[PDB]
Design a protein around this nucleic acid. Sequence first.
RNA 1: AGUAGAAACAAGGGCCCUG
Lengths: 696, 158, 772
Amino acid sequence: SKTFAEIAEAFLEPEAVRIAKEAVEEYGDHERKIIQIGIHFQVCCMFCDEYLSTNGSDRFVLIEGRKRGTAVSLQNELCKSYDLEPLPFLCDIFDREEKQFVEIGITRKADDSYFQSKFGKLGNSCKIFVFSYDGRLDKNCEGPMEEQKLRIFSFLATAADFLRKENMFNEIFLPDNEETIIEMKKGKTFLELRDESVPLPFQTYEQMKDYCEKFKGNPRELASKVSQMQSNIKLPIKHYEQNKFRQIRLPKGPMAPYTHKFLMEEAWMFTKISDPERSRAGEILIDFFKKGNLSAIRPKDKPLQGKYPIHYKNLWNQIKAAIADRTMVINENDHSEFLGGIGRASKKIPEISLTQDVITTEGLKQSENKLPEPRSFPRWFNAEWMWAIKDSDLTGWVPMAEYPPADNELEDYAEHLNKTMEGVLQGTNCAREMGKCILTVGALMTECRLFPGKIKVVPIYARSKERKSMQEGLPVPSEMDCLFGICVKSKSHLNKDDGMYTIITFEFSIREPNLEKHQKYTVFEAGHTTVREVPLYLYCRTTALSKIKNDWLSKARRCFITTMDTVETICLRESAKAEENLVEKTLNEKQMWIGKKNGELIAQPLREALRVQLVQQFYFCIYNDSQLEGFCNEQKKILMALEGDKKNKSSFGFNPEGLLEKIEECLINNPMCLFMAQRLNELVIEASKRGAKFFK
Amino acid sequence: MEMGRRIHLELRNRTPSDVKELVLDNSRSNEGKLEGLTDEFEELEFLSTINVGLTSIANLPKLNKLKKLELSDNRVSGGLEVLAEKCPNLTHLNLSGNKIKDLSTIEPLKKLENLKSLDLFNCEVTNLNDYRENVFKLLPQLTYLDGYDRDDKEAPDS
Amino acid sequence: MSLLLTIAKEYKRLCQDAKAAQMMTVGTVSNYTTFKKWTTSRKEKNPSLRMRWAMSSKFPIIANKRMLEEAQIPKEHNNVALWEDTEDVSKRDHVLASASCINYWNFCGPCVNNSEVIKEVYKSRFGRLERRKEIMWKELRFTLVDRQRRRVDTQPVEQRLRTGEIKDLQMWTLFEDEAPLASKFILDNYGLVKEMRSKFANKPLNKEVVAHMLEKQFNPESRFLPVFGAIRPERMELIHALGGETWIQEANTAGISNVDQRKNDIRAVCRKVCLAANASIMNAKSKLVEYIKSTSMRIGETERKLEELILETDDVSPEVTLCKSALGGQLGKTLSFGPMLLKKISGSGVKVKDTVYIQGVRAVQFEYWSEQEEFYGEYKSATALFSRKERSLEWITIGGGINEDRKRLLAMCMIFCRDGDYFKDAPATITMADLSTKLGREIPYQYVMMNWIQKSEDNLEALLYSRGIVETNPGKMGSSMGIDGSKRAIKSLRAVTIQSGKIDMPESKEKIHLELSDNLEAFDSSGRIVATILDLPSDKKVTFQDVSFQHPDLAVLRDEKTAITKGYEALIKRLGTGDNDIPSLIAKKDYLSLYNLPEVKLMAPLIRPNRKGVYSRVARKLVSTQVTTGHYSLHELIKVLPFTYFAPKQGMFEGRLFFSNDSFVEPGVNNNVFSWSKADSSKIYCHGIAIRVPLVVGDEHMDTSLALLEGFSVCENDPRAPMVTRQDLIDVGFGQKVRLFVGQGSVRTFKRTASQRAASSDVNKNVKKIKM
RNA sequence: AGUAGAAACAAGGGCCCUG
């Protein structure tokens, strides 16, 4: 249906299509008229109807489909034989019985214009029948037989339905005799512009068109120009083996500081036996506060480090007062105002109310954008990773759904592998953070949605399940509610997408604070805690969140999919090369290098490197930014070069130094990027012992 | 078609009070429920409803002059006590082709003292042992059964 | 009712305004579509976040108001908010509510009489479940599956139709009062429309949903996917749970929703007609068209015309391609060369003749293209990506899985490109008897060589030997093919690479018109021969079931049953409109005239003369009972009118009405000699021959709006005639004019006289005259 | 105060409303 002929073939018989096509080609007119002319011919045929005369011979003789040359020959032959006067113009059918011609016409408009014009041209000489698509007949003589009318008018109705459906029932496709010249209505201005947008050597669209319509190929000149451009360029080609990749340069300065909202390693938590009835956030916080361990906290005036202590102490006291009243709404005071920035939003000044005097009175200059500053590699990230790769003395940290039934072996295999991986992955500490993020952000999302304009108090909590020992001892292990800390959210009046809303986080600890790492926080020694007794430290941050970070953190559970895919991408591949179920053996045995220790390469099975993969995906969720995006997008080239080195493929490049420059430009104040780059350099170093293409 | 239009068609301007016969065969009735009948039909003496996807008798008005009924090809089951109140002057009934399981459903017909002939063919009840006799002993007034009297006496044409 | 008055008052209020009046008055109704877009324009960037943000709110669902009041749904069942009086800003006829309300409605709301209708609405998905329940899963294994990327269909569908045909199906199964003027398809396939109509009539349903679901029901979802193993819609719908690149879940799915046997039967029939219509040298094409038009076949319950099936099908096979060409159907850009498949990726060329001496000196011209040309190829369980250049095979890369198929593909490809010395100097064995004119038609050299290779394996080995053999260089051992299609050897065919993994099938959504010559040679707007009759199986005998070859030459029955069938056709040919015909006589209760109709007089001799009188009495009686009461079965009337010619007599009626040929018809029960069904009341099966009855008058079973559509026709507009309802069409007199609203925004004039002559015949005849 | 980036937020509209 890409060309008109198919659209005519949809209802018209293909023969009339071919006829009208040949006719259009002979005239040389557009083929858009294949639709009208074909219709004109089919009527004529179905007009004839194979009727006969008194002598048992054919009655009607067609003249239309015939070529132009033979049309006037048959016309004159008939005008002569029956002794008739020759007509000036051509006709469509010659009724023998009545010895007179019959013209046919078809006008879309239900009006007598076409009939009047045709009659005026032909007068009353012969019989004219002006059919219409919507059932109207205009003639100058007796009407045709009933059957002829019924067949013509039914065909025309169907045709008009099938045109109106396709938006082709217009003057364009069905014009009358006069309106046969459609053309873009060229306006004075459009031409004035077209004659101005022409390339330089030409000065009028006419010259450009005349030069382009006749353009001929001269490969000698084209080659000469190509060679002249190939000589004045000197495109550099650099095989890496000769020109090696210098080590990535990392910036210099102070250590990158902790930035994630919720403490992972340090955070100290309080557990309480699960109550199904009281499962709500506020109810859980009330239950935890009532035992009385929480009420012991009484921070000292002087913090170990940090700034703005008094505000934090006041807000902690107000939170405790709130719970006792069982109303988690904070009043607007100086401390909450300063921490929440309720009123530190610049007031817009109109320009019409401006003058040089106002500019002088208060400085006015374009904001001097203070781009980020450079921070050196963090030496503490490895410790967080190693700790996050250990069990948490509990399981069931993150919520997962149930396993459905099974019918075929494939589902049983999928469910066994998933069960093994979920068992491995539910015991770590990273997964504890997955649960803490999902639950805390869910609660904070449902508070900011319901109670904006109220500086609510939301806990930082999670739910878990004590491990399963042997049948000995207490069976049927119980559940547990954990309380890592407490949060609050200043007014979350999120009028627009990707908003901004300051929050504040109090979290417990039993560890001394590092100056370099815990720069963000403002710790407060808080009495003692049992396990024997141990000192306490209350880490009070003032972070900020948005809608998008909330929605995505509440969907950190994605990491399971990616890690599972990678692990089963390795296991199915290893099993296929041997055509046997090799998954358990692959998981238990396959050793995956995960670091160095004492100048040697450590290795551990896959079953324990799933944890490393999971931490990688979780940290990608946490520290995602533009920097990490650009970096992880631009480091692939180096890995591809590594692969080329492994397989003796003589890779090459055009300007690698610029690539390294681009990379080192996007390494700023984001621990993950810097750590990953340092590892990438150590990798290329370790591989240089068994490979090439890298400098020391 | 539909009983409503079918009836309105059969009634060529005739009032529903002077007819003596009616036919509704090869139509459909929503919910297998009659629709359009009332007590206006008084002179009615015959009725025929065949293959209309019928399953019950609940909207049946009161018809006294009715003396012959036909419900073949449907799936009626259970409702047979209305006949003692709406059509007490009934004599001929036919149910071949309907869902009938036991005899307890048939017992009410004893109250139709005007009953003469009954027609049960292709029903589950027919697949029992000594059923013609048990029915005859239940409905003594009856003489003809499925077109055959006791001793297999073929009944006349009409 | 009062609702009607409300609609009229609303229209009045709308017209009282000025702007609404302008927009309604000007133009046609199509503007509605346009107006349907300027309203309710609002999208959202991240829908997930918006939905999660919204759901937290107390009342995240807009809902109807009056329906809630009617259903006695209170605002709070038990200290739980459900809705509050308010108006949605955009709609202005809805009230906010919460999701909890659905649960309440689900557990104690209004209950409908029956919800089994959903099983018909989503018949596709229930079919999916039923098919899935019959799969015996065997055993997961692991191995590197070879997958080929090819276009396939992923939905088993019966009676696949086009978008144009389907649109009428929705209108004619749900909205009949607003149906457009009757199309050809609706008249032809009236059993399907009746079957769909019955299920969804007098039912409480959202009509739009049902229409959309029927649209999906009739759409075979074609996708370009990786594939392994057999190709069947039953598998492709769940291929995701059968195997990937590294694993395979074996399963036996052969006996579910067989869709391949009907495609096979259609191709067999096309082969049979193409081989029949080669006898007429001068007018093979016209004979072919007539042969196709006068044939049909049964699909499930319905009987469909072969011409429409060929148009709908997508079998890219040489048999179907020629037939599609003759009818005028456009088809895919897919060549053929014997039992092989091809697809031109690139290149060009132009015919160039060259001589070949068959034996000693016997010049025979053969045409060869002259340009570089890449070609995908496909033989059974093998594929290739070859290229040619100026009468030379430049290279061929094969990725099949079998040796025999590989050799056959290579040989047919070499032949395709007319490479090798043999084309220069023909083999000694081939003779002039086989060269050409098996039945008076010349056979070019290439097809001669193709037949030669098929005749004997030794010729094939010689041909492959013609291509140079070299020594397998080191390393290339794996990418080499011997004479026995070995994966590797010490000596191998020149420039014949071999690899593992099927060559991915190309794709192109193009439609090329192609004609055909008097010798059934399909040209395609250029020299190329897409297909011919010399690439089909020689011949074979088959017993086709549920098919109708209603043509004299294509018939095996004797003069007796043919005569009876012709007589019944003639009797059904007087069922058309106009006075002195069966329907008009029935309306005038003039049953007596039926006994003297010409066709009964012609058919009377057949009737068994010994007891003609007794049969005549019974059939002459039944008609009266049917005629007088007004309750009649048109089919029984047609069945028993042949017997009403003779004078009644006296005698005992056993039960069957015999002819003079020991064939009877029992009055009421369908049998082979005469059959029909209440489902499809527009077919009469006489000795397994389908006789279409025109739709000029309804019957008690068939009665509906459709059974009269053929009778009516359009005529010159007359404003005097009355404007009637669609239902009253049944009561109008024959040869009486009447105005009628049709479809949307169309008022026409219909006259109850059937005038639908064959259009194809008249055009063909007139056009042939232009060539004299 | 804080977020993050190469600019924006740190409520906005009319004593009252809203994402």
